[PDB]
Ligand binder design. Structure first.
Ligand SMILES: COc1nnc(-c2ccc(Cl)cc2)c(C)c1C
Ligand SMILES: COc1nnc(-c2ccc(Cl)cc2)c(C)c1C
Ligand SMILES: COc1nnc(-c2ccc(Cl)cc2)c(C)c1C
Ligand SMILES: [K+]
Ligand SMILES: [K+]
Ligand SMILES: [K+]
Ligand SMILES: [K+]
Ligand SMILES: [K+]
Ligand SMILES: [K+]
Lengths: 157, 157, 158, 158, 157, 158
């Protein structure tokens, strides 16, 4: 089988945790669409797409695309049959169950798969990283270099 | 005993999960007040009351009423001794424990009872249903027909 | 007459169980405190001992009936003409197991409605297992057990 | 050819397990349903019995291979040339244990990628243990098991 | 060792749960800084500092101070080596793990310690107390007397 | 002199336990690593073996004292003149049990203050049980155990 998978999120900004997950996905499926949600917001959609493209340029079977529809609607149109979700902690799990049962109702031919990040990134999030950086904390370790540079520029002005 | 129970919520809108819970409550207690909170908001309070009355019209011992006070204050005034809460997942449980211990402090003669919805509705919520419908997803399966029609009208304008 | 069943292993019955069954009697006309034989749990007290301890500890509640059973709980509930199934909800961890049991029981007997009650803060962190563990090491558990149960626990461990 | 392994004790295999392995076969070219001997769990069925039950229950799935093992799971996965490790995610409580196992397995075999699938709502509240418990008390578990497994469970308990 | 510990929070307002935690901390460490975050808001920072000072005046090794930097940045500057966190329920625990691993990245010489409040305060929060009081519920039992008086005055106007 | 007790079964002591006790020694003047006999858990190593393994594994920490006990933990803590009770907090699931134990211990000895420390991310997904399970199947657990403990575990299983 030549599986097409979608890895959706806001990626605001994309972190080393996201890179970890999408890297694992590319080792599992023939084509991975890194789908950036237009809504919800430190970086614009065009900023978030460019940062994610640069940070995944080394992965040959990743396609970075923006989308504004319901995720399932975009997945259906893209002929994806696998929905990548990253699993960090118990707290996300309940919402992930809700979301996956809803997504299965909306598009039963799209199978949710949950990947586990490395221990290194199992306790971070885009939200926590932004909050720390906005309040003068060091987040260099959690971001690709291009994202780190864009984040510093964003927080300076 | 002729128990009076209250089933409070925002019911914005009332879903098949709420219908499930209140139906179970009516099989257990002589009178069930479906109490619609005035605050927090897709449908107005008058819209939410009308939709809930229509969706529960077949249940002879349900009374749909709006309220704006602290839930416990309204329950006390209504001479309710049972407080119906619907239990979906672990994530709600911690807040439910908080809320029930607070409600027991405010009105010790009001006993919180937790009912379990059917597996069919154990992974939905008014919030998730609204979000999906607002973003062009199909939520017909989760709502009474009158609510489905009102929701489509609401999202069209 | 609304009839509710409160099943459990009750090995032994604690003040947390007394809390839950008391709340149940304020809500329903008749409450059957149903003690499961639970051989797989290797209970410290025999079923006969646990029934006697619960009968004594609930004698002050006029609408409680203590019965032992080895049947399928759902069959025992139907045979007791119960339409309400009482379970106490203490912590996040048992909530998940309670939902499994309740969905299974609903498959076995859909007209038996599971209801969960919340114990007082006083008993929200104890369990039969924890009290037994403290007592095995001679720690004071008078605060967590009815008087007759405490005596019996002391005697059993002596 | 992408090869995935779905390991577990499968004592016995339930409709929830059939759900997960079916989803796996729609995603990966070949799925090894790997049954751990699990002596520490004192399984109701022998490994041979559990393999035979799973073979019959998955015969309709052309790309499932049922094998028993007593090895370290990670070594068995490497020796099956698997690069995907399937686990089903039912409730919040096992999620934590699943992460421990997956992080350990990643230490043992980093190229074996753990993936978690979510069963249908129908089977999200059952388990081999719960079905066995109901059946020990003669409750009807036909709905939760493949036909051959139900027969075998009835026979074993008779 | 003569340990300096920091107990940070918004304390809006300080509750009997906070008093419980800080009292336990003072029995464990030589000096406890009760650090009040300037950001996020019923009482102003100056109101929250004054209420906390009055409510902890009986504790001789407590110092109430406001701060506006990243907590770890303030802890570093204060030469704190212990970070007091109060642990109520499972729901907070996941965020507490996130926060503590981030704080350990930001300042590894600051050790997070988790204290457990009494059962009496294990189901309350500043947020729940404010919400109940704003909606005409009795919260006298959860607050120091000075905080109760200030809260009534605040809600009257 | 602030005295803290770090009780546990330590069967065997892991790098996660070493992490927690090290953090404790940086916070308190004297730390008693207290090994519970825990017969109900059927430990792999005797109490004497577990004390010897922990003594060797903590010899580099000058303010750690390793002692075995079969008493009620709270009584042992009082008799060690401890006023701080160290527990490590790994996952969501044990958090609930830890609160039960801590509230019970506070009832038994209110001046013993429970404190929870968080291990490094490196050890946040292991346990004595998991390491033993991997080792029973000959998987490599060198990374998770002190050298003397790894040797002893290999020898015991051989
Ligand atoms: C099935 O649940 C959902 N699936 N997708 C989305 C969604 C994602 C991205 C974008 Cl741009 C638009 C909509 C939402 C909001 C929900 C609740
Ligand atoms: C005891 O906790 C509570 N109980 N009731 C309410 C409440 C519900 C509905 C309405 Cl209209 C007003 C107030 C709130 C906000 C809280 C925190
Ligand atoms: C390491 O995580 C954090 N640590 N400290 C703070 C913080 C607290 C109080 C104040 Cl005034 C400013 C910043 C925040 C927002 C985060 C996410
Ligand atoms: K019990
Ligand atoms: K209980
Ligand atoms: K299994
Ligand atoms: K499963
Ligand atoms: K241990
Ligand atoms: K630990």
């Amino acid at each position: 089988m030549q599986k097409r998978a979608i890895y959706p999120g806001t990626f605001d900004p994309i972190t080393n945790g996201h890179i970890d997950i999408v890297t694992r996905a590319t080792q599992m499926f023939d084509h991975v669409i890194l789908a950036i949600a237009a809504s919800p917001p430190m970086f614009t959609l065009e900023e978030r797409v460019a940062l994610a493209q640069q940070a995944t340029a080394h992965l040959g079977n990743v396609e970075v695309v923006g989308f504004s529809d319901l995720m399932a609607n975009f997945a259906r149109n893209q002929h994806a049959t696998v929905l990548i979700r990253g699993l960090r902690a118990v707290a996300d799990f309940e919402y992930e169950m809700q979301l996956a049962h809803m997504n299965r109702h909306l598009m039963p031919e799209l199978e949710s798969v949950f990947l586990m990040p490395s221990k290194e990134w199992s306790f971070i999030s885009s939200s926590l990283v932004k909050e720390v950086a906005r309040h003068q904390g060091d987040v260099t370790h959690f971001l690709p270099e291009n994202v780190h540079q864009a984040l510093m520029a964003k927080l300076a002005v």
